Amino acid sequence: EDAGLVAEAEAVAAGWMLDFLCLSLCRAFRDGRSEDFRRTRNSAEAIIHGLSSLTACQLRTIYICQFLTRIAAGKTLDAQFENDERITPLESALMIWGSIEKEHDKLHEEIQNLIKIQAIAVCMENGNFKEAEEVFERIFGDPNSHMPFKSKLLMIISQKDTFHSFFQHFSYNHMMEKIKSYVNYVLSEKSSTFLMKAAAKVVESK
């Protein structure tokens, strides 16, 4: 009855708010507005938590929001994003990057390999050399690891050289620019969604 049509109407509005808050999250991430990213993240958290069921399109949207929240906290090692207490922020986004149903194109591999490197490099910008070895074993012992730098990374750990020039080439800045390139691709995919296109027309004529 009315209660059933209300529950359906609140589900349609919740899907509109998720696509909007996803676009606002990608935009604050691209621009680098940290405070707006923190507030848009909290809004996206509760809107997602209020969704009963999920479509395949909404599932990808949640993964994209998850991917940005952990890249934004990639250098914060003690920030636990998963129930699994051993997953560092960067290897959590590494699992999400492989979970997003997307094109495994050239840019996908570059982001993936840069995340694997920086997941260890972040652990060595601090004095967490033990955590770096345990991150290497989780990402790379056998055999899902066709990265040639598997040998160089395993050697850099036992060097204690924090300012290693290998990490200055495959740096956090290069990882951010590759991700922000994909963020721009997502930012234009759903820039024509309902809630944003409606609010844009209100301001465009104003």
Partner: peptide, 11 residues
């Protein structure tokens, strides 16, 4: 749902 965006302070 069973998805998380905010972290806890001890990993």
């Amino acid at each position: 749902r069973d998805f998380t965006l905010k972290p806890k302070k001890r990993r």
